[PDB]
Amino acid sequence: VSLMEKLKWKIKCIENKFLNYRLTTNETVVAETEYGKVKGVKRLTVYDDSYYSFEGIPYAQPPVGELRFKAPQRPTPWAGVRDCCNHKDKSVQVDFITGKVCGSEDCLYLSVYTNNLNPETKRPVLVYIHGGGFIIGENHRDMYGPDYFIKKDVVLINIQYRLGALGFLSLNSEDLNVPGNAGLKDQVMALRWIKNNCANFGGNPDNITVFGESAGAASTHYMMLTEQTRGLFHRGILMSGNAICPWANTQCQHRAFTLAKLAGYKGEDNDKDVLEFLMKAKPQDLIKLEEKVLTLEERTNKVMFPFGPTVEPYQTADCVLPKHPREMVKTAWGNSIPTMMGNTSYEGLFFTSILKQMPLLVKELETCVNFVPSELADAERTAPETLEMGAKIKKAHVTGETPTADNFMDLCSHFYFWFPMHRLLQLRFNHTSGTPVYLYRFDFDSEDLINPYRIMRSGRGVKGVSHTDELTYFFWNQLAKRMPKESREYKTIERMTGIWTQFATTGNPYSNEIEGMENVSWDPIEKSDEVYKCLNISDELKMIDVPEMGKIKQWESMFEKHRDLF
Numbered sequence: 022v023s024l025m026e027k028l029k030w031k032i033k034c035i036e037n038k039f040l041n042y043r044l045t046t047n048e049t050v051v052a053e054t055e056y057g058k059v060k061g062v063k064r065l066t067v068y069d070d071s072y073y074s075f076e077g078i079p080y081a082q083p084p085v086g087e088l089r090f091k092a093p094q095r096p097t098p099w100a101g102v103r104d105c106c107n108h109k110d111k112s113v114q115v116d117f118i119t120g121k122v123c124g125s126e127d128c129l130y131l132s133v134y135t136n137n138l139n140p141e142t143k144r145p146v147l148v149y150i151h152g153g154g155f156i157i158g159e160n161h162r163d164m165y166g167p168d169y170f171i172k173k174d175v176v177l178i179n180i181q182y183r184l185g186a187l188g189f190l191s192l193n194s195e196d197l198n199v200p201g202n203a204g205l206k207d208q209v210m211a212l213r214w215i216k217n218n219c220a221n222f223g224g225n226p227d228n229i230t231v232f233g234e235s236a237g238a239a240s241t242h243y244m245m246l247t248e249q250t251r252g253l254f255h256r257g258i259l260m261s262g263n264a265i266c267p268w269a270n271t272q273c274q275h276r277a278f279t280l281a282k283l284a285g286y287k288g289e290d291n292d293k294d295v296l297e298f299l300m301k302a303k304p305q306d307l308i309k310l311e312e313k314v315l316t317l318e319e320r321t322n323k324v325m326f327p328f329g330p331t332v333e334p335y336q337t338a339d340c341v342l343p344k345h346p347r348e349m350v351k352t353a354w355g356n357s358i359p360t361m362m363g364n365t366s367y368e369g370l371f372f373t374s375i376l377k378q379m380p381l382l383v384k385e386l387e388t389c390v391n392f393v394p395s396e397l398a399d400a401e402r403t404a405p406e407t408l409e410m411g412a413k414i415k416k417a418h419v420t421g422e423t424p425t426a427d428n429f430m431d432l433c434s435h436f437y438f439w440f441p442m443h444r445l446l447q448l449r450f451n452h453t454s455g456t457p458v459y460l461y462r463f464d465f466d467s468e469d470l471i472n473p474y475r476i477m478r479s480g481r482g483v484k485g486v487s488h489t490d491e492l493t494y495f496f497w498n499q500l501a502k503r504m505p506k507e508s509r510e511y512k513t514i515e516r517m518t519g520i521w522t523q524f525a526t527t528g529n530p531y532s533n534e535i536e537g538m539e540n541v542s543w544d545p546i547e548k549s550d551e552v553y554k555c556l557n558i559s560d561e562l563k564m565i566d567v568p569e570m571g572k573i574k575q576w577e578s579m580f581e582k583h584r585d586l587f
């Protein structure tokens with residue numbers, strides 16, 4: 022975090038405020054909801070388009086006081102008209118630029134957008150779930166502006182949900198009603214709201230697509246796995262993530278005590294007293310301290326976050342994750358809806374800024390033992406089996422006699438994204454009606470149009486297509502500009518919003534009306550396939566064999582003598 026990047030962020034925040042006002046119109050409107058009337062307004066885009074905007078729609082009771090760490094409750098209906106011409110605050114979190122805690126405990130809202138409140142036909146409804154490691158993110162239009170998607174005749178909905186310890190505290194004690202996954206339960210309630218109210222905004226409740234990137238993709242997957250959401254939607258898109266990625270879940274039940282102690286709790290480790298203390302702490306204190314919870318051992322074993330989605334220790338009415346996601350894949354209703362998955366062509370490039378602050382990490386590639394899947398590794402990672410397995414990973418990613426930064430980031434692409442995708446695909450194939458899954462590979466590189474995550478990963482001057490690089494061609498953000506109609510950036514926006522809208526509509530991502538798809542034949546993956554095929558999205562759109570396949574198989578070989586765990 023550099024203060025050049027902070028003042029420039031501050032000014033760009035000042036520019037966004039002014040530009041947001043300028044793009045507002047006097048055309049206010051009112052829609053019905055099952056909780057009562059809401060007022061939206063129409064807004065403009067830098068491409069001189071327009072959309073109706075409804076923000077700050079509550080799908081839940083504000084989870085403050087006694088509701089903190091609890092499952093969300095249905096909100097209270099109102100007489101009259103709720104104001105929805107302004108956004109609400111984001112979930113309490115550390116601002117990844119300024120480094121200070123921001124946002125609010127009062128954050129359970131969604132936003133609805135559409136270019137036409139009164140469409141002649143019922144429209145496809147796309148529900149976006151933002152990523153951010155389940156610890157940062159927002160549905161604010163400064164990061165996720167609908168300006169591109171509203172060029173299309175869809176209804177787009179952006180949700181928030183509780184982040185970090187406030188979203189994912191978990192306690193073993195059944196008396197306390199904090200089993201965990203509050204934030205995922207937030208997601209479930211927002212979906213239930215969407216199913217029952219999208220018609221009011223011109224949306225077809227029988228054609229809803231959920232999609233998300235990173236932790237949003239893992240989230241989308243959880244919404245496809247849990248029985249809580251059965252039938253609530255009809256297509257799913259997992260962008261650079263799913264629920265069996267190693268970062269997408271953790272058993273965090275022991276960590277609440279550690280948080281409390283970091284916050285000055287005095288007493289013993291029992292769930293009741295830990296909870297009573299955590300209930301009274303300022304929310305900003307728990308979030309700022311969240312960074313210190315993980316032990317050095319956990320960090321070494323690649324646990325990324327102290328609080329996240331978890332296997333709930335006991336069952337409740339609102340339980341989302343009754344067992345490990347791999348098990349949930351066995352019985353998952355979501356296995357039988359049209360699915361599209363994909364990754365970018367150099368995911369691990371995202372880890373530059375972290376590698377820069379911790380150069381020693383590259384030495385981990387000398388044996389690679391710390392990247393062996395945890396379920397296979399011994400605790401000390403000194404077992405000869407673990408050294409053998411680490412050697413397989415090393416052979417896959419270390420190019421010379423000494424490991425480099427790029428070898429590290431390439432390995433990261435597979436550890437965090439490609440290999441879990443592979444495991445999910447093969448697992449899913451053993452438990453599905455036969456509905457298609459399509460693979461894309463996002464391979465479009467540009468520095469002419471960016472999003473704020475590039476400022477976070479310090480990918481300025483850096484070639485390749487990182488984790489989150491594709492967000493730029495889906496959503497408006499306050500660093501974006503109006504691009505020339507014939508620019509490669511503008512055309513990629515059209516293709517990406519076009520493919521996504523196409524799949525949402527029909528469950529098949531192909532359309533010959535999308536420019537560049539003239540010679541594309543986009544077939545979904547079959548159980549019998551030994552080599553994955555994917556739509557490689559670059560300046561050219563091209564069906565190719567997944568380049569990463571060789572390394573994927575090499576990761577898979579670690580499981581040769583433990584096939585039951587694959």
Ligand SMILES: *[B]([O])([O])C1=[C][C]=C2[C]=[C][C]=[C]C2=[C]1
Pocket residue numbers: 152153154155234235236237268325437
């Ligand atoms: B994604 O933005 O939810 C995401 C954030 C941070 C990560 C750290 C380590 C591995 C994977 C990540 C994904």
